[PDB]
Design goal:
- The structure is cut from a larger assembly and holds chains A and B.
- In chain A, 29% of the residues lie in helices and 19% in strands.
- Chain A is an alpha+beta fold.
- In chain B, the strands form four sheets. In chain B, strands 2-3-1-4 form a four-stranded antiparallel β-sheet. In chain B, strands 5-10-7 form a three-stranded antiparallel β-sheet. Chain B has a three-stranded antiparallel β-sheet with strand order 6-9-8, with no helix packed on it.
- The chains are: A alpha+beta, B alpha+beta.
- At the A-B interface, helix 6 of A face helix 3 and strand 4 of B.
- Chain B binds one RNA strand through strand 1, helix 1, strand 8, strand 9 and strand 12.
- Chain A: This is CRISPR type AFERR-associated protein Csf2.
Chain lengths: 324, 236
RNA sequence: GUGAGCGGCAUCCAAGUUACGCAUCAGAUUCGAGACGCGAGUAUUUCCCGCGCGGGG
């Protein structure tokens, strides 16, 4: 059962690509040596094949949010906003291992390595939450397929299709954001400011001498990081392998309450803020201005409510239990 | 190749001569080698060197500044500035001293036309007769151009920077004159020039020195910043 | 004129048939492009210095 979510971000998305890439001024990637050089944090990109109105296929980088990040975002949103209040209403406490397993798919770095009994397999897969994601010490295959957040772009036509060709963007959608780190030494101009500091101006000057002598690290740093520009429209594709009504209702509730969560990175700079523009369920739009609602979706919400009001921590503690 | 400039933010414009006197005064006795190196003294004696000084002082708008020339100048300023900073902190217990450390690359490339270069502080007064010779450009050009050329070549040789063999300079003039003294009670004074404009057919990168007797704080000028032409904002 | 002399190990033959590298994981947290470049000085002198000449306010 395919779910397509049309996501428009009102703040830049910042998913940092691992590695210390260096930039000069005026935004030249990997500049020639000799010029000024600064560490640049490149946004996460995936190379995809697309024809840019030429007819020949070529691989080009595309700034995306990795699918694992979106899967974890969905998991966390579901847990905080739906399941956790349900457990708190019944005053049921999760064990520490159960909490870790529900929040990261496993309670430790050592998988059990042995299979599961069939009754336990079906019990865990029928669960509204554990069935979707799975994991645990003994490995279990979840029902949830989460794809990466592909931006609607001329490079994404060969991937997402021509259904959303009306929202494509031609040019690049990434920009460099420059940041600093200023010492408190510059903003001291009078000892009156330093009335809160031990030893006063003498101690401050001693510290500044230490900084100039033996620290080099220091509290001065001019750096930059690449962000995906705001306002670009994204497509999120979610697939489920033969789910029950309760699981679909849970996913719909998470989508309803997803807007309260950031996508990735830039917590300090309010990065990752988005609004869900359109949700499509098996080729049919179920989104409303209020949210996921309508007669076509009432049964899922009823089923997920009936699952939530009568769920306990027993399933979680059994799932997190290891057979070693 | 590299020029290091360090500025101490004391909060008031102090003339370079008194600045050098006081920095000498603070380091009396402690670390004698640092004193001998910073004061440009022959090892074993307190006399100064006639040779071009690798230690440089200048009058910052907010205080006084130390300038090192070459690797030796850079090394001496590097191991010196913490000591002078500590001494200044010791003497001024209720003021924050701030240190600004910036390096300039030194480069001099030829150029088939001339550019407007000026300095706030020239030592041009040698004889009183030559002082009145400035009315006519022809009479006063010879010694001024000779001074500029010799100063440039000697500082280049001191820093080991290649210079073209075909430098010709013509003088334009200065804004006014000023008087300077060893001490406020001294009765001996010299005449300098402010805004001494001369045109050279080459590029001067970084901060530069012209004239002679520079350690006391004369003849320093940032030719690179002057090329930006920020001298327009001078009005009341 | 060596118990010598003379004398094909040769023909034919299938290593092939079946098997999922798969299941489960947030590149996250922190930091100012704003500060800095002589715009304030108020005129004749000595012991020694590089050495007639070049020099220390």
């Amino acid at each position: 059962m395919q779910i397509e979510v049309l996501i428009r971000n009102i703040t830049p998305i910042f998913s940092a690509a691992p590695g210390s890439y260096y930039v000069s001024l005026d935004g030249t990637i990997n500049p020639p040596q000799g010029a000024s050089r600064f560490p640049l944090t490149r946004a996460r990109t995936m190379t995809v094949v697309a024809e840019t109105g030429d007819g020949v296929a070529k691989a080009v980088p595309l700034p995306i949010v990795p699918g694992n990040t979106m899967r974890n975002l969905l998991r966390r949103t579901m847990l905080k906003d739906v399941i956790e209040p349900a457990l708190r209403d019944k005053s049921a406490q999760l064990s520490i291992g159960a909490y870790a397993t529900a929040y990261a798919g496993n309670s430790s770095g050592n998988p059990d390595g042995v299979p599961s009994s069939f009754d336990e397999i079906v019990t865990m897969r029928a669960h509204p939450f554990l069935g979707l994601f799975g994991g645990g010490p003994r490995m279990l295959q979840g029902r949830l397929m989460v794809d990466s957040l592909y931006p609607i772009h001329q490079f994404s036509q060969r991937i997402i299709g021509s259904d959303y060709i009306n929202d494509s963007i031609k040019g690049g959608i990434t920009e460099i954001v420059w940041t600093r780190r200023n010492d408190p030494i510059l903003q001291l101009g009078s000892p009156d400011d330093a009335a809160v500091i031990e030893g006063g101006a003498q101690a401050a000057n001693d510290w500044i001498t230490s900084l100039l002598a033996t620290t080099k690290r220091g509290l001065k740093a001019f750096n930059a990081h690449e962000v995906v520009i705001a306002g670009v429209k994204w497509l999120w594709r979610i697939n489920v392998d033969r789910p029950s009504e309760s699981q679909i209702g849970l996913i719909l509730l998470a989508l309803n309450k997803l807007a309260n969560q950031r996508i990735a990175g830039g917590h300090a700079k309010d990065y990752g803020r988005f609004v869900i523009e359109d949700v499509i369920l098996d080729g049919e739009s179920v989104w409303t201005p209020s949210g996921v609602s309508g007669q076509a979706t009432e049964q899922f919400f009823d089923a997920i409510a009936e699952a939530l009001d009568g769920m306990t921590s027993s399933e979680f503690e059994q799932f997190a239990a290891s057979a070693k | 190749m590299f020029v290091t400039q360090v500025i101490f933010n004391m909060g008031e414009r102090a003339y370079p001569d008194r600045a050098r006197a006081m920095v000498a005064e603070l380091m009396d006795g402690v670390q004698p080698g640092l004193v001998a190196t910073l004061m440009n003294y022959i090892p074993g004696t307190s006399t100064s060197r006639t040779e071009f000084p690798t230690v440089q002082f200048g009058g910052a708008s907010d205080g006084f500044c130390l300038l090192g020339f070459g690797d030796g100048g850079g090394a001496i300023v590097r191991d010196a500035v913490p000591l002078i900073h500590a001494a200044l902190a010791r003497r001024m217990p209720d003021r924050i001293i701030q240190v600004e450390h910036k390096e300039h690359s030194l480069s001099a490339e030829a150029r088939p036309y001339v550019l407007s270069y000026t300095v706030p502080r020239m030592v041009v007064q040698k004889k009183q007769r030559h002082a009145e010779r400035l009315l006519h450009e022809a009479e006063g050009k010879a010694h001024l151009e000779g001074l500029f050329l010799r100063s440039l070549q000697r500082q280049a040789a001191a820093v080991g920077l290649p210079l073209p063999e075909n430098l010709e300079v013509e003088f334009k003039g200065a804004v006014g004159n000023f008087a300077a003294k060893h001490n406020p009670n001294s009765k001996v004074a010299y005449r300098g020039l402010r805004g001494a404009v001369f045109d050279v057919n080459a590029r001067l990168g970084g901060i530069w020195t012209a004239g002679f007797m520079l350690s006391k704080g004369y003849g320093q000028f940032n030719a690179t910043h002057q090329l930006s032409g920020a001298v327009n904002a001078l009005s009341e």
